[PDB]
Amino acid sequence: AFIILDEVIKVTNRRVNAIEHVIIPRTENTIAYINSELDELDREEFYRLKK
Amino acid sequence: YGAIYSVSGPVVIAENMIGCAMYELVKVGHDNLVGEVIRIDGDKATIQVYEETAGLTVGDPVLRTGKPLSVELGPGLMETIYDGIQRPLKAIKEESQSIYIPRGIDTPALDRTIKWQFTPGKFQVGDHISGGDIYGSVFENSLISSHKILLPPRSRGTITWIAPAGEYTLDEKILEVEFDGKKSDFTLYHTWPVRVPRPVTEKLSADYPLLTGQRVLDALFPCVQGGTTCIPGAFGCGKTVISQSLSKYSNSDAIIYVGCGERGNEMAEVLMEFPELYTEMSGTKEPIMKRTTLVANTSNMPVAAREASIYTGITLAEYFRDQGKNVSMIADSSSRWAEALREISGRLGEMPADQGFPAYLGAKLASFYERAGKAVALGSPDRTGSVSIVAAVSPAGGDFSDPVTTATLGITQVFWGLDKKLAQRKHFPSINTSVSYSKYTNVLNKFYDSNYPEFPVLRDRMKEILSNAEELEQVVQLVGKSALSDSDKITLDVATLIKEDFLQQNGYSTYDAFCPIWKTFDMMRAFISYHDEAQKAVANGANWSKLADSTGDVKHAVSSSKFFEPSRGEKEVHGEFEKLLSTMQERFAESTD
Amino acid sequence: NTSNMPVAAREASIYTGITLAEYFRDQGKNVSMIADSSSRWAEALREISGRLGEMPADQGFPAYLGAKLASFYERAGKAVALGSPDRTGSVSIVAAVSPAGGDFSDPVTTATLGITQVFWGLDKKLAQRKHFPSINTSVSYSKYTNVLNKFYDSNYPEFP
Amino acid sequence: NTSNMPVAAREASIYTGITLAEYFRDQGKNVSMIADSSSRWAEALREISGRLGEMPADQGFPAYLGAKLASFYERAGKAVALGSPDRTGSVSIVAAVSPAGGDFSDPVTTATLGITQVFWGLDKKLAQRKHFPSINTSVSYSKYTNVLNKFYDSNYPEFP
Amino acid sequence: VFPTRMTLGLMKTKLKGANQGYSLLKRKSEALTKRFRDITKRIDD
Amino acid sequence: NTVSGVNGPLVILEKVKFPRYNEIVNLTLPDGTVRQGQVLEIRGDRAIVQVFEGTSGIDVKKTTVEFTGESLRIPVSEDMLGRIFDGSGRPIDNGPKVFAEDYLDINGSPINPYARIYPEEMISTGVSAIDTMNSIARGQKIPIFSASGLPHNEIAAQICRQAGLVRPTKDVHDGHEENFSIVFAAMGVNLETARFFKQDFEENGSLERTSLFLNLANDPTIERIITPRLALTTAEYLAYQTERHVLTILTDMSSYADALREVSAAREEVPGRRGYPGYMYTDLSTIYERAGRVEGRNGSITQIPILTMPNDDITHPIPDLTGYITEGQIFVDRQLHNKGIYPPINVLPSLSRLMKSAIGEGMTRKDHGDVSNQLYAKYAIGKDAAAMKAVVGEEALSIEDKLSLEFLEKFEKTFITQGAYEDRTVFESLDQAWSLLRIYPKEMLNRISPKILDEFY
Amino acid sequence: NTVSGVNGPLVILEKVKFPRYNEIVNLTLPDGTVRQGQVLEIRGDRAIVQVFEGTSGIDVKKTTVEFTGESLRIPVSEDMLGRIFDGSGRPIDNGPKVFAEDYLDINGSPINPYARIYPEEMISTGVSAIDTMNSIARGQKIPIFSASGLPHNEIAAQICRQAGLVRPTKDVHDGHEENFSIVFAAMGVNLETARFFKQDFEENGSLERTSLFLNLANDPTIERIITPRLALTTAEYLAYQTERHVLTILTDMSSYADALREVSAAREEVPGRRGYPGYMYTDLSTIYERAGRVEGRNGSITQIPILTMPNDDITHPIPDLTGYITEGQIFVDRQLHNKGIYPPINVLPSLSRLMKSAIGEGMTRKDHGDVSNQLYAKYAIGKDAAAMKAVVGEEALSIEDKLSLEFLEKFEKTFITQGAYEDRTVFESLDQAWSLLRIYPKEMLNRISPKILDEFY
Incomplete structure (x- = not known):
């Protein structure tokens, strides 16, 4: 059982670190760039119409 | 000028x-x-x-x-397909040789050369009358009189003349009322501005459930009559197919079906399909068609034409409510009405205020839903009518928090979900259990409770199973299946049964796609009776796998519930379902031991 | 000023404080200036901008915003007062900011971190534990440290 | 031309350079016209709409952008020469653009891409490893490839 | 590249997914690592 | 002068410049139909009015205008409790007038009759979850933020009706010895939903304690903004002059955001992001200005606004700005609602910025602040622990977390689940709290003093 | 009188009130050259025109104007096919001389044909991914959504090339015994692409059967959009008057869209939502006006417009407004392209909601609806599983998911991979669909009614 545990801990550790480094900050970078574009559309629309 | x-x-x-x-x-x-x-x-x-x-x-x-x-509300409304301000389309086909007249033509609101049967009411000479009173009727359905000819609001006085029963024209007099001098002579029709509401004596809460027939709609929360309802879309969710299914299954006195700014192909679909469909109670000539009055407007007609659409349709529903009839108004798509409000905004060249949408947009929506509702009929005789509005939505602003969807979800009282991805994969009409609420549920369920169903108790547990399923769904994706306990597996497993039988809806009406509310309770009763047994077995010791083998026969039956018909057991529920409750118990005792 | 009280009073609030403070700097008095909060303050401006019918800029917050935030922090600092006596004063501005639009990356906060030489964080967990200010060593920095450790070392401490 | 050298020069640059390519095409010469960089031309339309007081369209770039670009590419092609001896000449346009939103989602890249037949991407991740010109299969196509590889096949290569 | 309008609802839920995943798998890890330490000591003896 | 034009909601009148601002005008139509409005703008021989009812159906040479000579005010009295008004302050009684003793202007008051004094006395909503974990105090505002996955009005009704049943429980405790009153404002409510609120007050006996001002979904956007201003002035009168604590319930703030966004703060002018004005803040701030502790020092107006989050969003302008002005919030969720939890209130994303410090001691025991630390902590740990159970099982699950797994369940099913007309006093609420913590030993409740814990466990 | 101004390509003429709406004006320039123009608007003692021809040659007051007296109408005739036209009407073969038997409005306000008979018999393409999944019926407007960064023009050319082998496929199905015509409308299309298109029709032998209207983007914007409108009207002549079947391929819808934005910038109209107009919808509906089965109930006009997603998303204005007017959509993927599967269609977000109605018996099976449902569900799971493989690892995966991974590959490389000239019958395409489906046993398939399943398994 100890040997199977030995194997499984290595896999499971890889995964916690993998979600942490690659996924979460990719998700931050994307969400911000499209939020700022999206907001820009609503405000510029008003500005062109008002002018 | x-x-x-x-x-x-x-x-x-x-x-x-x-x-x-x-x-x-x-x-x-x-x-x-x-x-x-x-x-x-x-x-x-x-x-x-x-x-x-x-x-x-x-x-x-x-x-x-x-x-x-104004538009004329009078004789000739049913068994007829109309435009946005109502002029006989059928007459236009033949004469004009075109589906709607050329620019620069005007045709009359109703057929003028057609003569109708007047019956005198309960208001004779010297009897006092008021708006929403029945001065007479025409017949426009076979088994019933679907149309009560009513006095318009703010019409009063005492009657100098009631015309006796016989044939008259719709332009010829049948009533005269004297008030402030001669008030007027009245004809079979009346005109009412359509942008403007038709008054009510008073509104009385929706509390009468009456079928939707669809398996999912009936299940999560009860069906409702006199309610107000939003159903999502994306114009690729089988929105036309459920509408046709919806018309046949509703057993209301009158239906108004409104194509707001639709394909033309969709308008063909309904006009052709309706007379083929048999009315569930007892048929009429061209059954469903004869009980429907259609406003059929395409999008390719100007922006003006599409805005009068929603309006004239609700005005026919509000007259009918005042007449003493429970009306189903099916509107498809309310987002196309909103699309139209945008188009007039662009053309007028007004500034937006609503994310690329006009100032008046939020207010116009809010006003529409209020005209709909359950009421005690306008008039001195007092009758019951209700208008239940089923309104389709879809995005229109490129956003998931779009002005059409947000302002409508506020004013609505029943909200039943629908996901585009499930619907394509075959689960139409689809439903999202965490993005739904219904305010009418509490009274309606209690209504089903008294008639025979154990209904309230079941409804809460169905949602509960589905709630835990979402939580489980994330663990299942990530870790896998190899870590969940026996209890958790069941939750998913009974969830499968509900997804299979309620969310999927096989055919127009084939495969017994029509489920009555009582059948639906029985379909649900079979799954939750199974869930509680299933929960006890694992807890009292019995592997998920072992429990699945041993359940066997009773599980296949509950799986097979949707092909079966209730019309060969009793007449609304199945003898087969009653037998199913005994079989469950027996199975369980063997399997546990 | 609470946010309910007129918008003139909100906008004038920082201004009135800095001019008053600066005068006390001329008097030869060392002033601690506490502002709460600049996120609110940026909002006073955005409100005025939409009413008038001028266009605000980035994130719906005005054009004039950045020059106004910037002038305010640079106004504060250690000086020798005007006139022959030459008394020493200081004005230290500690301004509070919160998220504005619920994003703490929006223009207001981000503009101000660039100007700042001093940062001391706040964390909800650390605040529950009674550590105040709620700082560790990476939610906080000071670039004033260099000159300051030098100052203290002179006084007698082995400080640096 | 130089960066703030007259905006008439910049706007006109692409039209003048294609006109010169066309004269040469009519003699029956093959020309290659390398426009470098038309992103700056796109910036010149942004400016022309604002200074004039016209309203622009999506992302502060006008829509007149799109028609004006399409006309420019159409002046290119492989051709049979103007005039009665008959020869074949060419004007072959290869035009750089850039982001303007730090994406390929911006109006400039997408409009020029709409029209184009050859697409050669940009990969910031590969550029770091020291790769130039950095492209990938997923960000590039040529609709000419099929016919081109057969041509290359003749010369000796196993190219298709 | 990334969508022009409204990736945000999706990206919100992507953000949520990621974050729950990290917590749970670190708990799963935490239990495996905790048990393993105890088993390591039993084994040496 | 006659009507020049109407362009959308906004009406242009050519009428002369001699009317003042806030001045009521009467639209005299040839259809026997009189409609009233308030000048949005008064200009040089033109005025722009938005009409309180309707916007269309007027002419440009058969509709004529007259100026009343009297600005927008409410006749304020204390005979207004037990009476049904609309959104102009006109009755929908179908009987006697409003009644006045003063006429108060509605704009956030002419004189501002409020002082700033820190809250010090508990206000109770009759539900344990709100009161223990995120307490309400006199002159403190804590909104209920809910979503369109909830029956948000129906929950809103439970808060409101259970109020003022609290007042006899507080009376024995000696925290309130002066009367309770309810001021209810409906903005953008449905006819059926409106009815439910009213029937719930009759049943409880709370009809006598409330005045309802009604704005219907079909009434103009300008009618809708007038509606809460009527309610708060009426509350301000009760509060200042006869020393009552008055709890004002404003549902739905979301409709209120909609009316402003649409017009009357976006008339032709430029609004901020997502069509919702940047001075939407300024408008919210007017409501908050007429709320708070008032002269008397037994008088306050305590406010519970209800905001319904469009799709549960945390990047939309509406919950964020509103959320800065208010001192915390109660967050409701969809998750609890599905499970069959009623009312479905979670106390983990929720915050009350000042818990013990806001409220008093004398009608609430001293243990309230301490107990809240323990319930919050366990609840947090408890969410995490359930996710862990699902994976690990119960063969390797932690002991601390095993008790917290069971704790998550009880916290929902008894402290958060309550009846429709079940009312619970604050003392009672505190006792239940300890019962849930009673399962843990002392060594897993270590964030509390042994003196308090030894007494309360 | 003379030009008041010119702003962009649009011209302001100060002239008298005798021109009608969409009435042609003839601009007389002192260069000895006439250009033609169409009134976008007529307004008091002025007209707003955008000139169809030229773009300079304008003068301030040396200009003279004269009104043509005739509003734009198409000369439509019995023979229009086998001829090359331009919308501007320039001679490149034919263009100004094209015969005439009627002059018809582009507006299509007199005849306006619209279905009132259900989408009748099947229309063949020989692509399994079109016919099986979505299915096409006469009178249908189902769009091909393609992308930029991939050649949208190439996917239009494969549809063109296999088109007209289609009529034989229908002949075989029976109840189609009438002529086939293609009406090809080009707007914004490159000169090189134009030649390609000409080539596709030619190779099949449908050149004789096709009418081409050509515009390029160096022609003014207003002209570009009128060019397909003239072509639909010509199609309408063939369809209604001589009872033929017309398939009209309208490319490029983005190009139609591009024009709309540019037009209007100082008129009553002004560009709205997201920089693309608020009346963009109407413009798409004018193209939809002349679509459906025609009157008398033989013939049909069927329409497949060609649309390009510019960033590969449905949330962008061009795909978003359109898909609503359409009744489903067909989705083209970049990822199948890069691999080298041609034609590359991902079926995941592809549905046409009148599939049930479109299909019938005697030319399509009863299993047809059922078959599509099965492919989506497995194809969807397979995709979802491939993503989890990537992050966490194969500890999440299960045996069922292996069937699914395997099923994705078989579907992509067999169903979606076919020729540009390799046409099929509908019966074959359903037979190949089955082949893929054989790998799940009967008990894991539940997207078909079990009755049907036993027959065809």
């Missing part, structure tokens, strides 16, 4: 126009096109013309008729 100042788009502006209101009927140019003056800015009046301009000249005269734009 006026002189045409600009023709810009299908929008016409005309000068020398004063003494005109914002509801006033106006005829535009010397081709006399149908129009209405929506707004006025100074001497210049801004007029939306509900036919197109393809050679409308400037400086042609514009004649105010001296009265508002």
Whole structure:
């Protein structure tokens, strides 16, 4: 059982670190760039119409 | 009177126009096109013309008729397919040789050469009358009289003349009332401005459930009558197919089906399909069609035409409610009404305020839903009517928090989900259990409770199973299946049974796609009776795998519930379902031991 | 000023404080200036901008915003007062900011971190534990440290 | 031309350089016209709409952008020469653009891409490893490839 | 590249997914690592 | 002068410049129909009015205008409790007038009759979850933020009706010895939903304690903004002059955001992001200005606004700005609602910025602040622990977390689940709290003093 | 009189009130050259025109104007096919001389044909991914959504090339015994692409059967959009008057869209939502006006417009408004392209909601609806599983998911991979669909009614 545990801990550790480094900050970078574009559309629309 | 100042788009502006209101009927140019003056800015009046301009000249005269734009509510409404301001389309096919008239034609609101049967009411000579009183009827359904001819609101006095039973024309008198001098003579029809509501004596809460028939709709929360409802879309969710299914299954006195700004192919679909469909109670000639009055407007008709659509349809529903009839109004798509409000906004060239949508957008929506509702009929006899509105939505702003969807979800009282991805994969009508609520559920369920169903207790547990399933769904994705306990596996497993039987709906009406509310309770009763047994076994010791083998036969039956019909067990529920409750118990005792 | 009280009073609030403070700097008095909060303050401006019918800029917050935030922090600092006596004062501005539009990356906060030489964080967990200010060593920095450790070392401490 | 050298020069640059390519095409010469960089031309339309007081369209770039670009590429092609001896000449346009939103989602890249037949991407991740010109299969196509590889096949290569 | 309008609802839920995943798998890890330490000591003896 | 034009909601009148601002005008139509409005703008021989009812159906040479000579005010009295008004302050009684003793202007008051004094006395909503974990105090505002996955009005009704049943429980405790009153404002409510609120007050006996001002979904956007201003002035009168604590319930703030966004703060002018004005803040701030502790020092107006989050969003302008002005919030969720939890209130994303410090001691025991630390902590740990159970099982699950797994369940099913007309006093609420913590030993409740814990466990 | 101004390509003429709406004006320039123009608007003692021809040659007051007296109408005739036209009407073969028997409005306000008979018999394409999944019926407007960064023009050319082998496929199905015509409308299309298109029709032998209207983007914007409108009207002549079947291929819808934005910038109209107009919808509906089965109930006009997603998303204005007017959509993927599967269609977000109605018996099976449902569900799971493989690892995966991974590959490389000239019958395409489906046993398939399943398994 100890040997199977030995194997499984290595896999499971890889995964916690993998979600942490690659996924979460990719998700931050994307969400911000499209939020700022999206907001820009609503405000510029008003500005062109008002002018 | 006026002189045409600009023709810009299908929008016409005309000068020398004063003494005109914002509801006033106006005829535009010397081709006399149908129009209405929506707004006025100074001497210049801004007029939306509900036919197109393809050679409308400037400086042609514009004649105010001296009265508002109204629609006639009267005889000939059912068994007929109409346009946005209502002129017989059927007459137009033959005469004009085109589906809707050329620009510069005007045809009368109803057939003028057709004669109708007047019956005198309960208001004779010297009896006092008021609006929403029945002075008579016409017949426009076989088994019933679906149309009560009522006095318009703010009409009163005592009757000098009641015409006796017989055939009259709709332009000829059958009633005279004397009030402030002679008030008028009245005809079989009445005119009422359609942008404007038809009053109510009083509203009394929706509390009468009456079928939707669809398996999922009946299940998560009860069906409702006199309610207000939003159902998502994306115009690729089988929205037309559930609408046709919805018409047949509702058993209401009257239905108004409104194609807001639809394909034309969709309008063909319904016009053709309706007479083939058999009314569930007892048929009529061309059964479903005869009980439906259709406003069928395409999107390819001007923006003006699509805005009058939703309005005239609700005005036929509000008359019917006042008449003493429970009405189902099916509107598809309310987002196309909102699309139209955008188009008039672009054409008028007004500034947005609603994410690329006009100022008036939020208010116009809110006003529509209030006209709908359960009420005690307008009039001195007092009758019951209700209008239940089923309204389709879809995005229209490129956002998931879009102005059409947000303002409508506020004013609605039943919200039943629908996901585009499930619907394509085959689970239409689809439903999202965490993006749904219904305020009417509490009274309605208690109504089903008294008639026979154990219904309240089941409804809460169905959602509960599905809630835990979402939580499980994330663990299942990530870790896998190899970590969940016996209890958790079941939760998913009974969830499968509900997803299979309620969310999927096989056919138009084939495979017994029609489930009555009592059948639905029985379908649900079988799954939750199974869940509680299933929960006890694992807890009292029995592997998920072992429990699945041993359940066997009773599980296949509950899986097979949707093909079966209740009309061969009792008449609304199945003898087969009663037998199923005994079989469950027996199985369980063997399997546990 | 609470946010309910007129918008003139909100906008004038920082201004009135800095001019008053600066005068006390001329008097030869060392002033601690506490502002709460600049996120609110940026909002006073955005409100005025939409009413008037001028266009605000980035994130719906005005054009004039950045020059106004910037002038305010640079106004504060250690000086010798005007006139022959030459008394020493200081004005230290500690301004509070919160998220504005609920994003703490929006223009207001981000503009101000660039100007700042001093940062001391706040964390909800650390605040529950009674550590105040709620700082560790990476939610906080000071670039004033260099000159300051030098100052203290002179006084007698082995400080640096 | 230089960066703030007259905006008439920049706007006109692409039209003048294609006109010169066309004269040469009519003699029956093959020309290659390398426009470098038309992103700056796109910036010149942004400016022309604002200074004039016209309203622009999506992302502060006008829509007149799109028609004006399409006309420019159409002046290119392989051709049979103007005039009665008959020869074949060419004007072959290869035009750089850039982001303007730090994406390929911006109006400039997408409009020029709409029209184009050859697409050669940009990969910031590969550029770091020291790769130039950095492209990938997923960000590039040529609709000419099929016919081109057969041509290359003749010369000796196993190219298709 | 990334969508022009409204990736945000999706990206919100992507953000949520990621974050729950990290917490749970670190708990799963935490239990495996905790048990393993105890088993390591039993084994040496 | 006659009507020049109407362009959308906004109406242009050519009428002369001699009317003042806030001045009521009467639209005299040839259809026997009189409609009233308030000048949005008064200009040089023109005025722009938005009409309280309707916007269309007027002419430009058969509709004429007259100026009343009297600005927008409410006749304020204390005979207004037990009476049904609309959104102009006109009755929908179908009987006697409003009644006045003063006429108060509605704009956030002419004189501002409020002082700033820190809250010090508990206000109770009759539900344990709100009161223990995120307490309400006199002159403190804590909104209920809910979503369109909830029956948000129906929850809203439970808060409101259970109020003022609290007042006899507080009376024995000696925290309130002066009367309770309810001021209810409906903005953008449905006819059926409106009915439910009213029937719930009759049943409880709370009809006598409330005045309802009604704005219907079909009434103009300008009518809708007038509606809460009527309610708060009426509350301000009760509060200042006869020393009552008055709890004002404003549902739905979301409709209120909609009316402003649409017009009356976006008339032709430029609004901020997502069509919702940037001075939407300024408008919210007017409501908050007429709320708070008032002269008397037994008088306050305590406010519970209800905001319904469009799709549960945390990047939309509406919950964020509103959320800065208010001192915390109660967050409701969809998750609890599905499970069959009623009312479905979670106390983990929720915050009350000042818990013990806001409220008093004398009608609430001293243990309230301490107990809240323990319930919050366990609840947090408890969410995490359930996710862990699902994976690990119960063969390797932690002991601390095993008790917290069971704790998550009880916290929902008894402290958060309550009846429709079940009312619970604050003392009672505190006792239940300890019962849930009673399962843990002392060594897993270590964030509390042994003196308090030894007494309360 | 003379030009008041010119702003962009649009011209303001100060002239008298005798021109009608969409009435042609003839601009007389002192260069000895006439250009033609169409009134976008007529307004008081002025007209707003955008000139169809040229773009300079304008003068301030040396210009003279004269009105043509005739509003734009198409000369439509019995023979229009086998001829090359331009919308501007320039001679490149034919263009100004094209015969005439009627002059018809582009507006399509007189005849306006619209279905009132259900989408009748099947229309073949020989692509399994079109016919099986979505299915096409006469009178249908189902769109091909393609992308930029991939050649949208190439996917239009494969549809063109296999088109007209289609009529034989229908002949075989029976109840089709009438002529086939293609009406090809080009707007914004490159000169090189134009030649390609000409080539596709030619190779099949449908050149004789096709009418081409050509515009390029160096022609003014207003002209570009009128060019397909003239072509639909010509199609309508063939369809209604001589009872033929027309398939009209309208490319490029983005190009139609591009024009709309540019037009209007100082008129009553002004560009709205997201920089693309608020009346963009109407413009798409004018193209939809002349679509459906025609009157008398023989013939049909069927329409497949060609649309390009520019960033590969449905949330962008061009795909978003359109898909609503359409009744489903067909989705083209970049990822199948890069691999080298041609034609590359991902079926995941592809549905046409009148599939049930479209299909019937005697030319399509009863299993047909059922078959599509099965492919989506497995194809969807397979995709979802491939993503989890990537992050966490194969500890999440299960045996069922292996069937699914395997099923994705078989579907992509067999169903979606076919020729540009390799046409099929509908019966074959359903037979190949089955082949893939054989790998799940009967008990894991539940997207078909079990009755049907036993027959065809």
